């Protein structure tokens, strides 16, 4: 039930990396997402990231090869920090709140075109106090419940 939920979230995350929707993640797709979120991975780094989880050596990541990789992760001493790093990526103006415009910008980077209604619904799900923006607590609770 919690595992059912978790696999669906993992499939969603997979689908967000899979920009072209062909059912596999390429090094180019990983690089495009990482750059769009600000970063600068090297070619050597992108290739390493694939090469560790690429169990059949075809050079791309299919969902089992992504799903196994989530099956390795454990709750650790950097678990809460990891969520905080992600929050900081969404919060583009650094005011401590995720606005609708910030959320929409992230989703567009992840190959998703959301309607106004879809972005609103996402804010509503995470917006605890109903002020129309998402605080850090809102964000953390998303990944707890």
């Amino acid at each position: 039930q919690l595992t059912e939920e978790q696999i669906a979230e993992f499939k969603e995350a997979f689908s967000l990396f899979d920009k072209d929707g062909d059912g596999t993640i390429t090094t180019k797709e990983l690089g495009t997402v990482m750059r769009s979120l600000g970063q600068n991975p090297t070619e050597a780094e992108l290739q390493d990231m694939i090469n560790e989880v690429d169990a059949d050596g075809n050079g791309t990541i299919d969902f089992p090869e992504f799903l196994t990789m989530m099956a390795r992760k454990m709750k650790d001493t950097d678990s809460e920090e990891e969520i905080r790093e992600a929050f900081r990526v969404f919060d583009k103006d650094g005011n401590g709140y995720i606005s609708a415009a910030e959320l929409r910008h992230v989703m567009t980077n992840l190959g998703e075109k959301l309607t106004d209604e879809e972005v609103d619904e996402m804010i509503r799900e995470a917006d605890i106090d109903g002020d129309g923006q998402v605080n850090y607590e809102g964000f953390v609770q998303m990944m707890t419940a």
Partner: peptide, 19 residues
């Protein structure tokens, strides 16, 4: 479109993409 699932998926993607 599941708003909850989508937001959790995007956070996980962001976590992976940033470590």
């Amino acid at each position: 479109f599941n708003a909850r699932r989508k937001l959790k998926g995007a956070i996980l993607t962001t976590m992976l993409a940033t470590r």
